[PDB]
Amino acid sequence: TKQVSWKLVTQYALDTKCEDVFLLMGMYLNFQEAPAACAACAAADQPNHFNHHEKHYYNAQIFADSKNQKSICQQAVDTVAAKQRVDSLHMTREEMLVERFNFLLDKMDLIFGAHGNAVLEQYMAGVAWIHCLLPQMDTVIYEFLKCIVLNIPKKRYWLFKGPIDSGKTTLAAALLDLCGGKSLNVNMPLERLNFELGVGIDQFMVVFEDVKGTGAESRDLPSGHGISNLDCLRDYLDGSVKVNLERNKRTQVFPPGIVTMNEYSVPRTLQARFVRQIDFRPKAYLRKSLSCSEYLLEKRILQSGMTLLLLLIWFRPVADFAAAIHERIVQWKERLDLEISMYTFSTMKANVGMGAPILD
Amino acid sequence: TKQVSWKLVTQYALDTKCEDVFLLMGMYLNFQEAPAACAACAAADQPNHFNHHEKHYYNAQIFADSKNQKSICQQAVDTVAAKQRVDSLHMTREEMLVERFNFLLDKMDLIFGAHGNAVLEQYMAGVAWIHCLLPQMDTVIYEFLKCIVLNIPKKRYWLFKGPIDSGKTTLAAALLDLCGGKSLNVNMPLERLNFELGVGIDQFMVVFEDVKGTGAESRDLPSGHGISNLDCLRDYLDGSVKVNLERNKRTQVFPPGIVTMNEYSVPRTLQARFVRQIDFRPKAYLRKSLSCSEYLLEKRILQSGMTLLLLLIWFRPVADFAAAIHERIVQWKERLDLEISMYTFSTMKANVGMGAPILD
Amino acid sequence: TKQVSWKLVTQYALDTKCEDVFLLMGMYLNFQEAPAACAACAAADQPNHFNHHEKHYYNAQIFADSKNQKSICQQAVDTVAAKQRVDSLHMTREEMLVERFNFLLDKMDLIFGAHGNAVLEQYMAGVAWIHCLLPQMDTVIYEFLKCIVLNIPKKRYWLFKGPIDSGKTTLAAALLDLCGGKSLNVNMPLERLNFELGVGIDQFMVVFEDVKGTGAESRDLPSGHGISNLDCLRDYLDGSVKVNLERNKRTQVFPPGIVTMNEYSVPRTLQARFVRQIDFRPKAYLRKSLSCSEYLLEKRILQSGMTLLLLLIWFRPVADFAAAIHERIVQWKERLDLEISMYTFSTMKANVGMGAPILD
Amino acid sequence: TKQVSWKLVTQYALDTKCEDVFLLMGMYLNFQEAPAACAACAAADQPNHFNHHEKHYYNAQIFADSKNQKSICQQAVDTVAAKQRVDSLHMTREEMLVERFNFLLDKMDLIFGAHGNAVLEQYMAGVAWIHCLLPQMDTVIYEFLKCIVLNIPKKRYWLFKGPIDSGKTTLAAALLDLCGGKSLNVNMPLERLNFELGVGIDQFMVVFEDVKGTGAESRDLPSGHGISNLDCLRDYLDGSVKVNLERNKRTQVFPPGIVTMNEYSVPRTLQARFVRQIDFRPKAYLRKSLSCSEYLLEKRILQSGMTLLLLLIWFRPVADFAAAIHERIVQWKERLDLEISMYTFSTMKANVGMGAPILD
Amino acid sequence: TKQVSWKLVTQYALDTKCEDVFLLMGMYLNFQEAPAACAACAAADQPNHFNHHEKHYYNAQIFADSKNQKSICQQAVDTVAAKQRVDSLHMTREEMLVERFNFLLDKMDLIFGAHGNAVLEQYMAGVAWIHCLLPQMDTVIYEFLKCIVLNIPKKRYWLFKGPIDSGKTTLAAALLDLCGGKSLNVNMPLERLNFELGVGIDQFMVVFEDVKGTGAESRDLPSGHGISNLDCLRDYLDGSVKVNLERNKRTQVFPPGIVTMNEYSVPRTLQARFVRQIDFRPKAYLRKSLSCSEYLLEKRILQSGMTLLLLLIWFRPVADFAAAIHERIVQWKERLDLEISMYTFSTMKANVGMGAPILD
């Protein structure tokens, strides 16, 4: 009888960075039909399918007849986790950011391509709104990337503070997506904390999202254990030494990142853990401009790492990006130039400032 | 010795969307007897049996002699879960609703067919009662389907508020069945919450059923953690970003849906999460008409997604439905036309309004 | 080497409805000795042995030499669970009651037979006592069976209320045995509730036994969470929609049944969930008659489903039973006629009323 | 290569009623050496070894070379549990007591035999002390055995009440050993109760040992949940219906037995559950006689089921015992007659009454 | 291919009493190199290596090439546990103490031998200090051994009471090591107690170390649940009946031993459980002598079972030890005689009494 190549299934999982045994199984089974008569290959809208179908066709036919499908996929997924362990220890943090930028650029090549449905001008409208959120915004994002890549002890965490719908949640979500990190909830009691902190294993960056304090009920702010919990996690935030994380599973320097919170009282000991604090104040023109440009909210553009990378490609020269992605940055600069100019971009920012629709 | 085709058992599970290892085992074993002398095939009342018996007969005989029956069925059920993972990521939300409508139409073809026992006029009486529950009811249902399919951030959740037996529970149950979602209970403490929220993995929509608040004991309303819990789940309700769900198991945008509750105080922060609120007030004629038309309650017609789809087929033209199901909508319109007219339907609604039996 | 037929072991488990892996193993090993010299076969007092020994003799000899006995039995027991899953979805509720009546009649054929030790006149004395417990008792039982078979939403639960030794516990236990359901304890906190509710999976009916309330300590009634718990289980009691039961394991309409309790205060919201309430008041003559007819208590006759089925066979004509069991009802009517008459039965009820021994 | 007989290892486990996988493994490995030069066989002090060595010698040599020893023993132990399941359902309760008496008689044949070290006169001295503990003591024990064998609902539990060292703990321990039951601790909260009650699965009888109440601290009695817990276990104590026991594992009538406690207040509802209450009052002569006859305490004679069976063999005629053990009762009566007379036994009881050493 | 002898690996584990799967694996792998060029064999300082290398060399080479190393070692370790189960039931308690004394003598033969580093005069200095701790100390130790071997009900537990550094902890630790028992912590709540009590399974003796009471905070003594817990464990301490221990795992008479505690109030009911109480009072000369003879503390001599056995070999004649070890006691008496005399031993005790260095 024909033998299935476990190595080839693993190669597919490695090429697509697949961490889900069931997703892998389903995707691999979808390669068993003839690629010449494959409608998914003709549509060319799913690269994880159309770029691999021909290569995996004969192996997928054998896989379809297998009595050990889950085990083949478990070894493949384990190899992906094994590669991630090797990279977390050998890859430089700049190489880690290049890998994430390449993932975002692959997604951008698709959604703004011939077989995609995204509108590039709508994402550029988001770029204009984001550039209006803070002064020197391209420098804010660039200096955040430097903070994450350099990973300097005591200079690794930024604090985002402000009320609801102030751009604080949005910017933190977009920066998380740009770097490719994980969000954490520390509003739970200390008993469940260690399992939640374990989510940061092999992660590039993290966001401690919507951290709550106590005694702010008189200002309509909810009570939580967040601020108290974070104040007892100095070694995790500082990154001077390795911490023991469990989900024990790994001993590593806890990832850098962001803490987001409303207007709670910050203890002196927790305040000292942040190299920078950004205060987010709601601006009437930002909300108005957003209400007039609904596509931004509907298509989740403002929370996208692709929007922040387009901002960077728009504002920053080729030399500001790592050498390994220079060719892709140049091709994206040519693409953006065809559709927007410094004059039309300036009009978009002027439209934001007036609380009018960003696109005329 | 003869070898059992694991692929064929998987094909049966895929064709019937079987997610239960024991149900699959029992159903497959029932294919081992000769289909020519099969009473279940002659009765033709169970499509998951009579449409598959002949195809799986020889394989079921081999399956009956197997010493590894549970393992064969586990791989089959896993393949169904794998396909669901692939669809949750590749299928458009319109395609997801088409699949559910096709499932409801298959059930309708059976129960209102030659080998079925349901009475089509009784379901149409339910359509009349439902159309009397709210003004422009066909538009209410249609706009709910648009809300679920479009899945727009901050515009994904509807609030159903009213006392007991006000039509609030019934409409939410019928909309859940129409879309094919899951019901959730958030009246438990935060410690058990994450396991309950994990029920929403790969789901099209959800209902947070009978959410309880505090301090409404003086108005005979029970105390619960529901309203407090929902107020701490902004990212789940908004759908702006992906949430980490566990039953970790999957990172996804939490499904859209409905929250149902009695007349509790809604906090300003939780109130802002609903794009629409429908207030359900008990009407004496609705209860009276129901008491005179007992078949509605006895046969669970008012809670049925089939009743809401019949309402849609009755009120809305063919172009209001997706192109993929147009042929089935046309055949159902012809079926309904033979049994009810706009005049006889209007009499049914007039009978509801008088609190008299819906069917004369 | 000889191969054991897993299919034949499964067939034995299916024929005896065996749900216990260890019981199956022990019963099957007892078939390895020669049936011609088998004392258990000569005694003919255990049908699960003597009706299967000859058929399974050669396979049991091979089974005795097996190095995988537990696994063979696990697949057999799993097939029994698989069949139960298929029946819970395809069998009509009338067919489910026929299956239970046939199980009770098989037991009756044995204990009142040539190789049995039960005294039919003693069970008929129990029939007389039960018929004295409530007016029109044969109608009470028959209408309960109709309630369970019909399974109508909001009309599925009966409330049995009274002090200790009032016939309330006895009648509920006997009705449970007649239908073949499970008893549930809801006096535990909500944290453990879901695991207990999961006991109702694939069950025909349930009894929420000895439900306790609060603040009745001044009337010597114990405190418990029962009444509070049941008041938060409307969807389980009503049966309008399917509930998610776990022991997740199955999504189904929660079984119908009975709630038994002492004289606690019932909340308006929980009271509305019962289509009928029966109040049990202790009668001095019932206790006295029981003290004079000790065999009833000693032989567990009053709690037996066989006693309630004998009551039905005695009072009701052949047409009141399903067509599938008519031949067995006729044979039991002939058996009862040989031993009791309407005159001698009337004397037994007169003896109950006088608090004297039921049998003269 | 040579094959190990799993059936033969199972036969050894069945013959010795072995329920411990590790004990079985160790005992079986001790059969691998030549029985002709076996010192354990020459000593003849361990029947579970010397009566099986020759039969299992060749199989034990093969077992010694096995790479699957634990699995062979697991199937053997499982078969013992399977046989116990079959017996719990088919064996009459008289047959269950015969099996226990035969186990005690096998132990007695050994310890009072040529290769034993026990002194029969010392056990008879214990018989005299036990016969002085309560009036008509041989009738008390005999009526307890009738209570356990008959297992009549509401007439299955005896209450033993008294202070420390009153003979209450001793008699209950000796009756437990005589019947072969299990002791239970119900002084724990209700949360852990069900796992403890599960210890009664397939058991002949149980003792709820040293049950504690509340508010008796002013009388130097410790506080506990025992009495409160037992008051909520009516169905377990009454034995009118089957209870669901877990360690779910089995549905059965909870075993009969004894409840022992100090002088706590017994609630009216819990008091009604006992068919008999024995009050144990400390007697100065009993303690004094015991202090003068130390061998009773040192050799654990007063807590032994062998002491109670010797009491029965001494006081009761052959016809009072089941027919199956008549030959063994006759041989033990002849043995006792050689060493004690009704006159010398009467002197022993007179010595107890004087608080002097029982043996002159 | 070559086959590994599982029996031989088991034989090594049995010979070294190995209860650690990982230790066994590591020790066995260290036998794969040539014994002629083995530095560990030339050093001759580890008997578990040098006395087994040659015997296991060829099997260890095959073991090194095995793909099932952990499983081979698991069966070996299981056989050691199986042998321990057999011995716990068949070995006399005197034979159990002989086995422990032989283990201590093997260790003594090594550390005081040609390839050892211990100084015999330093251990004899410890013997002198220990003999100064209590009057008739050789009789105290000997009577403790009699108490443990005889294991008489109600006469099995000794109480050691005194403040910190009073010799109480040291003597209890040394007696534990001499007998080969386990230490237990009962200062935890009753919920975790049963798992801790399960540590006493198959153990010769136990020490309930540093038991804490309540309300002694005014005397600088810490609060704990120890004394309260022990007061509810009468059946465990008395040893009149078998207790059910879990880590259920085994039904056995709980081991005898010691309870150590500071000056807390002992309840009358717990006090009655001890056949002997030793009060430890700090003596200034004992601490001073210890400060001048640092090697005692540095080399853990005072806590050693070897020190107590040397005390016994020094003070007691050959007939005081079991016949099986007489030859080893004689050889150790000759060894001690070469290095110390009754005169030089008396000088050591005089040096202790003066608080001066024990060795001149």
Ligand SMILES: c1ccc(Oc2ccccc2-c2nn3cnnc3s2)cc1
């Ligand atoms: C409806 C409701 C809220 C809403 O606000 C936002 C929604 C998403 C992301 C950002 C915002 C805002 N950021 N921002 C800064 N200054 N004012 C604002 S609002 C927009 C529409």
Ligand SMILES: c1ccc(Oc2ccccc2-c2nn3cnnc3s2)cc1
């Ligand atoms: C008996 C008890 C209750 C009952 O009520 C209902 C039962 C099921 C579903 C809906 C209803 C009602 N919906 N509605 C709206 N205005 N009044 C009402 S009653 C009907 C019969």
Ligand SMILES: c1ccc(Oc2ccccc2-c2nn3cnnc3s2)cc1
């Ligand atoms: C001893 C203790 C109690 C006892 O009572 C009963 C025992 C079992 C089942 C039913 C009863 C009673 N049912 N009933 C109705 N009116 N009075 C009564 S007593 C009988 C004997």
Ligand SMILES: c1ccc(Oc2ccccc2-c2nn3cnnc3s2)cc1
């Ligand atoms: C030392 C400490 C206690 C002790 O008491 C006993 C020990 C074990 C078993 C029974 C007893 C007693 N039963 N009994 C009846 N009337 N007085 C007594 S004492 C004996 C010696």
Ligand SMILES: c1ccc(Oc2ccccc2-c2nn3cnnc3s2)cc1
């Ligand atoms: C430093 C700190 C403490 C210390 O005490 C000891 C250390 C270990 C073992 C025993 C002792 C003592 N046993 N003992 C009896 N009378 N006084 C004392 S002290 C010695 C040095």
Ligand SMILES: [Zn+2]
């Ligand atoms: Zn393709």
Ligand SMILES: [Zn+2]
């Ligand atoms: Zn068929």
Ligand SMILES: [Zn+2]
């Ligand atoms: Zn037979």
Ligand SMILES: [Zn+2]
């Ligand atoms: Zn032997």
Ligand SMILES: [Zn+2]
């Ligand atoms: Zn060596």
